[PDB]
Amino acid sequence: RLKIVTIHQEPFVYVKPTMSDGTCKEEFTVNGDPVKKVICTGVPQCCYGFCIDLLIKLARTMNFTYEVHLVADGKFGTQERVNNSNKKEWNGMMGELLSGQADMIVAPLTINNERAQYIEFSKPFKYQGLTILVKKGTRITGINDPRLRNPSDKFIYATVKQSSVDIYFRRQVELSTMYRHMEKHNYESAAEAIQAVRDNKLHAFIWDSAVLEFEASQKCDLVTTGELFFRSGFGIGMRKDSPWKQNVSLSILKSHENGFMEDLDKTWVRYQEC
Ligand SMILES: O=C(O)c1cc(O)c2c(Cl)cc(Cl)cc2n1
């Protein structure tokens, strides 16, 4: 069985406890359909969501058995220094895939050149990017809006401390002005930041576009605004010498063409009524 590694990241992967009898609660979408779930260890737990639906579709069309587990260190994966040395090694899911603890990463893993040098990405199953969350009525054109480009205590914007977004802004010389402002207001978690916008304590939250659209679709007082920026995509991760490489991509392309990927978006991200 293929060792699948994933991570808790709503709405792509939800993680909940099993019921008293060890099974996963039978639930259904507002649409009325049965929610597909799988046991993922990390203690057996219940995993479901956009990427789980995708894994199932792949497992079925490619005919392969699998077992899912949650990444041990709870990280997506970046190259960090080990034991106070200059030697660096991948942590998170990147690290588990390279070490053999996993044979495939199924999660919203952002595609980028640094990672592509060590592993192989399938064709993107969904595009990725950042957007801005604000309270309904607030007007912001995007990352180039005046109130973002020229910071002041009058309009507070931020992201999550030590997150991929925070690290990205910190490394861009061109964003130094925005970063100096953000570092003063960054939050401990995305949940707290989102709540701060609802409570009018944070005026704008910069974060993953799918996550923010998910939030806006359920909370009437919140909306995303401006054009998506710093784009890329999410892909399935596998070692370079993987035998499922071409087959995973061919399947993803077919799912794009037949409307399946859009169906997943409608189900897990774009909710009807807020
Ligand atoms: O490093 C990553 O791949 C990464 C990192 C992140 O921080 C991600 C967030 Cl908030 C949301 C989603 Cl849907 C995917 C994310 N991926």
With beta carbons less than 8 A apart as the criterion, state whether 223 and 131 touch: no
* Sign for the pseudo-dihedral over CA of 248, 252, 258, 263: positive
Q: Roughly what angle, to the nearest 10 degrees, separates helices 245-257 and 260-268?
A: 80
Ligand 1 binding pocket includes 208 (Cβ within 6 Å): yes
Instruction: Tell me the structure's resolution in angstroms, rounded to a single decimal.
Output: 1.9
242 is in an annotated binding site: no
d(CA 222, CA 133): 7
d(CA 230, CA 156): 21
33 is in an annotated binding site: no
Task: Please report, in angstroms and rounded to a whole number, the separation of the first and last CA atoms in the chain.
Answer: 40
What's the chain's length in residues? Answer: 274
Ligand 1 binding pocket includes 78 (Cβ within 6 Å): no
Structure tokens at 108: 């919203």
20 is in an annotated binding site: no
Residue among 67, 122, 60 nearest 248 (CA): 122
Cβ neighbours for 60, distance < 8 A, ≥ 6 positions apart: none
Task: Please spell the DSSP secondary structure of 77-133, one letter per residue.
Answer: --EEE-TTSS-EEE-HHHHHHHHTS-SEEEEEEE--HHHHTTSEE-S-SEEEEEEEE
DSSP alpha helices (H): ranges in the chain? Answer: 50-62, 92-99, 113-116, 146-149, 164-171, 176-182, 190-198, 209-218, 245-257, 260-268
d(CA 175, CA 273): 36
The Cβ of residue 129 has, within 10 Å, a number of other Cβ atoms equal to 15
d(CA 232, CA 185): 26
d(CA 114, CA 243): 22
- Rg of the chain in Å (alpha carbons): 19
Half-sphere exposure of 181 (CA within 13 A, CB side): 20
* Sign for the pseudo-dihedral over CA of 184, 187, 190, 193: negative
Ligand 1 binding pocket includes 12 (Cβ within 6 Å): yes
- Pocket test of ligand 1: the residue of 119, 164, 209 to mutate, having most ligand atoms within 8 Å of its CB, is 164
Q: Which domains does the chain have, with CATH numbers?
A: 1-128+232-274 (3.40.190.10), 129-231 (3.40.190.10)
Alpha-carbon distances, residue 116 vs 111, 113, 216, 239 (angstroms): 7, 5, 32, 10
Tell me how far the alpha carbon of residue 264 lies from the centroid of ligand 1, in angstroms. Answer: 18
Q: What approach was used to elucidate this structure?
A: X-ray
